[PDB]
Symmetry: C3
Subunit: 158 residues, 3 copies
């Protein structure tokens, strides 16, 4: 059975844990819990293939160099977290020693009205990296499966 | 004589104290003074009614649950303070145990040129909460009476 | 030989040192080095005049009141640094006891895709101060000579 090693990175509070727990357990963690298990496993069918997702949920700035693909997460109501993405991408480029790493840019908290990052800004950043941009809500589940499954489809192209 | 219990909330440095002192004393505090009295009282006539404003000027994150109406203040040159509004609104929703609380969204420092929050962004956030948006300058007095008097008119609808 | 006393100011990490080292030594400092010499000297020809640039590279918040002209630097991928410009300008206004100080607003890191400050936002802020806006990249050298030489041309108008 094929295993996909996914690593979730991005600034503190963007919803890395909430996104991963929504995917794995179909539950929204509505609080900020600073003691959540980093390692998640799930058997899923993606495009007719039974596979294992091995997910590492990292802390807002080892884990990195074992990763096959990366979710780079910011929050659409957190301009600083969007600006911080380049530093996370530079870290991934350094550990993978490549500018061709399977990666999805994730704009989380898309359920919230206080948007300070336009879809077009994030599309432009993702384009500059040669990666897809997907908006998600860990709260409503919008885009959550799409973000993780798209990352698997990006790993399959590597 | 009718008393209106107003509470001013929002991020550090957005001008909660400057706004309240401009309303009450017709003076602009041009410095950042970290030891300002939290409690203000003023007898005013609003729509022909002689009334008392009992204003609590809170610190950038009791006071809350006694409040009848809330000014949720950000600065139009402070994107983080605009993003922080949702956390202040969530706090008000928690203490008032209602999503129908008399509230005005205030975009302060509208005299400044370094605008990073568009009027339309703030209008959209206020719309999502079902509340008015008003821009103010504690410096020029623009919108200051309008912000506080509108909050009184919102309390009168509750 | 005419000496131009230039002072580079702005928030931590915007690239004040990278800009000054790119101008003086034609090298991009790709790391964040917290122990860089503050004082730079260079003999240059600007509009046919052989002159000395005496440059003071300040830390993200003496140096100030000796300055004849100021580069006020933010990063186009750092909204907070753009918002912080007004505080640096207010400091310059205080030490020079004038609202007519030779000054250029510099939008640095223009090579980066994660733009959160629009050119038009910065043009509007610069217009409000009566100063030019120039975009730079300490990395590619885009606009670097233009920023410093424009500041010299602003000092010559004082
Ligand atoms: N409204 C909304 N809130 C969200 C969403 N995702 C996360 N949150 C909220 O944002 C806060 C932080 O979420 P969390 O998953 O702990 O963030 P994190 O990126 O893992 N933080 P850290 O890096 O410190 O571990 C929580 O209160 C959570 O409920 C979302 O999509 N919508
Ligand atoms: N230009 C301008 N400056 C303002 C305006 N309102 C406040 N300020 C300035 O912003 C700074 C902070 O104001 P202040 O009222 O102390 O903010 P606060 O929200 O009460 N801060 P805290 O939460 O720490 O008590 C002061 O230097 C003040 O002069 C405004 O409308 N325009
Ligand atoms: N991509 C890019 N990076 C830049 C640019 N200018 C600076 N940097 C990077 O940004 C970081 C900070 O640069 P630095 O010059 O040290 O900033 P500073 O304004 O002097 N910081 P401080 O106020 O603490 O002294 C460095 O890693 C540097 O390589 C630029 O134009 N483009
Ligand atoms: Mg977490
Ligand atoms: Mg914007
Ligand atoms: Mg105060
Ligand atoms: Mg420096
Ligand atoms: Na890439
Ligand atoms: Na409401
Ligand atoms: Na000026």
């Amino acid at each position: 059975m094929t295993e996909y090693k996914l690593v979730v990175v991005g600034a503190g509070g963007v919803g890395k844990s909430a996104l991963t727990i929504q995917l794995i357990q179909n539950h929204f963690v509505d609080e900020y819990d600073p003691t959540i298990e980093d390692s998640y496993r799930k058997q899923v069918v993606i495009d007719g293939e039974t596979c294992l997702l091995d997910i590492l949920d990292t802390a807002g700035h080892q884990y990195m160099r074992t990763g096959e693909g990366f979710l780079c997460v910011f929050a659409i109501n957190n301009t600083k977290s969007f600006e911080d993405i380049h530093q996370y991408r530079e870290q991934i480029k350094r550990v993978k020693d490549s500018d061709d790493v399977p990666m999805v840019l994730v704009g989380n908290k898309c359920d919230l009205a206080a948007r300070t990052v336009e879809s077009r800004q994030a599309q432009d950043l993702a384009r500059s990296y040669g990666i897809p941009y997907i908006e998600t809500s860990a709260k409503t589940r919008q885009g959550v499966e799409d973000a993780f499954y798209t990352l698997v489809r990006e790993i399959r192209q590597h």
